[PDB]
Paper text:
The structure of C. thermophilum Vps33 was determined using MAD phasing and refined to 2.6 Å resolution. The two copies of Vps33 present within each asymmetric unit of the crystal are highly similar to one another and can be superimposed with a root-mean-squared deviation of only 0.56 Å (over 580 Cα atoms). Despite this very high degree of overall similarity, a functionally important region of domain 3a adopts somewhat different conformations in the two Vps33 monomers. Within our Vps33-only crystals, the tip of domain 3a adopts two different open conformations dictated by direct, intermolecular tip-tip interactions within each asymmetric unit. The positioning of domain 1 in Vps33 is substantially different from that observed in all previously determined SM protein structures. For example, after domains 2 and 3 of the two independent copies of monomeric Vps33 are superimposed, the two copies of domain 1 differ by only a 2.2° rotation and a 0.6 Å translation. Our Vps33 structure, the first of a class II SM protein, makes it clear why Vps33 is unable to bind N-peptides. In this case a displacement of the Vps33 backbone, relative to other SM proteins, causes the side chain of Leu-129 to occupy the binding pocket. Thus, both of the pockets that in other SM proteins accommodate conserved Qa-SNARE N-peptide residues are missing in Vps33.
Vps33 regulates fusion in the endo-lysosomal membrane system as a stable subunit within two large multisubunit tethering complexes, HOPS (homotypic fusion and vacuolar protein sorting) and CORVET (class C core vacuole/endosome tethering). Vps33 shares the overall shape and topology observed for previously reported SM protein structures. The C. thermophilum Vps33 and Vps16CTD–Vps33 structures provide a first detailed view of an SM protein from the Vps33 family and of its recruitment into a multisubunit tethering complex.
Residue numbers in the entry: 5 to 212, 223 to 276, 296 to 338, 344 to 546, 556 to 582, 600 to 654
Amino acid sequence: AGFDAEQVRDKARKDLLHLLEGVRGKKNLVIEKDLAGPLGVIVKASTLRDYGVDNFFFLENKNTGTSQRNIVFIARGESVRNAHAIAAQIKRIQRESQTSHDFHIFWVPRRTLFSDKVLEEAGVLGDANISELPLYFFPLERDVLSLELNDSFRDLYLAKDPTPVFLLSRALMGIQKKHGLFPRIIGKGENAKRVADLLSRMRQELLAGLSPSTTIESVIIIDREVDFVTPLLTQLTYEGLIDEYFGIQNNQTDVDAVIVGARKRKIQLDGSDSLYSQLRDANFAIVGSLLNTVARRLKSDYESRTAELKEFVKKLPGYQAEQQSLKIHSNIAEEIINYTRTEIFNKLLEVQQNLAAGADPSSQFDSIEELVARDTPLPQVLRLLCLYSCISGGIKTKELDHFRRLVLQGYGHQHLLTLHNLERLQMFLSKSSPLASMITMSGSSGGPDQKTNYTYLRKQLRLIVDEVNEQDPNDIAYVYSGYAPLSIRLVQCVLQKQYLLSITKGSGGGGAQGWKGFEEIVKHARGPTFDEIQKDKKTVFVVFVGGITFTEIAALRFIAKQEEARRNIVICTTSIINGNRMMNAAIETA
């Protein structure tokens, strides 16, 4: 009766395959490198072959073949870069003749004016048959939908491109068209508010036949800028650390070849593996113990004491898969264990946990300087400086100038750009800057965009949970060993008020809706608080504009398990983000 992630995949594959069915004959396929990964989430390469794909090409390789007269470009239309690349590629192909003279472009999801103009301005516009592929959300898991806009953090927060926000609201409207209006549109933050506004004005346009869902409870929209502190921190879940040290993209990562046990190899990382399903959301401290329990259960099943010989060989493939999974994750865990034992890592964690806990950030000054002396990697130092700034309402000017110098001398003068970019993103500011001040009620004002108050909210939303036990956690704070992501505490102000009241005020009636009971507190997080009513169990879509971490996902699944009876939780996002990705946005954007 309600939403299911599998229908998004089916529609996506159907939509793509139909367009491939419109290009009659076999065809060559040119794809934006970044789109290639997410496309694999909805269709298998073997399937594309069955629909006439002779060869596959990455647009950026600039080496499209001749073997087939049909050429198909698949790329994002919002990208200024792609419009040029495709035009260049058509002209370069046309003049290496007589090769392949039937061009198609599938723009994702929408044809833009800028793109149509570039093609015409290059002359090739009357040569390509242009379609539109309405792919928005890619379902990475049953409970995780992603726009897979890996540059959207930079695009939105640095470059001020509104496109990620527009695309997210269209994706969200799509769901309303199929399952009814979200009864409630709830959220925090300037960009999340704009998502609501665009959802509103889109509805208003349709009335020119759409009713509240019977199967959807609400949509909660968190704006990532409300809480930079969470991504800056080192993630301490299993998947979180795999992301921190190896990097996860399209449900995959690359690891040294010795790790897979027979350059580096690619490994799949999703819920189809029974073991990873149990490991990914666990605090890394209990992973060794989880592996041990699995290995033991495995040894026990093997030892659990004709034509059962042929039964054995049929079961042979399932035995390697389990074995291979256990072997690979044991090897990864041992790798991460090594990393987390170094003095640099222990020193890092210490400064992060102190700042997070609320120690005077000046008391961490000598530690930070020592981290620079030891040449710890640039992204890790920058993430500390940002945490410092973001958590304490800016850095003391005199310390800022010192840190600024250490960074430039230690890692290179080019990083003056990096720091200016961190300044534009408002994660590296002096206390003397008006933009740096956190929200208070004794705050006078100024402040069009006053910042989240972590000093106040640490207490009021109980960001620090000293007691949490990682072996059978009782609180989302487990994802950072004692620290609770603010973003998800905000989701809890809506979804688990009984519980949240229980651990902050007492006497946790508290099963009604909106931000009731938390409005004055949530006023101290950045941007607008909103709650808009539009006039089996139900799904709550929890949405992040500007990126979610694997730790927030783990914490959301934790809550999902507790809320199992009453709700289903579906996580939506413009992309999956982490601390390193944010620093890269600042480093690489000239």
